[PDB]
Amino acid sequence: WVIVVGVIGVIG
Structure with missing residues (x-):
């Protein structure tokens, strides 16, 4: 929460 890869x- 809130990682974007x-x-x-x-x-x-």
């Missing part, structure tokens, strides 16, 4: 835009 690629998209993949919901983690973490």
Whole structure:
């Protein structure tokens, strides 16, 4: 929460 590597835009 809220990491964005690629998209993949919901983690973490």
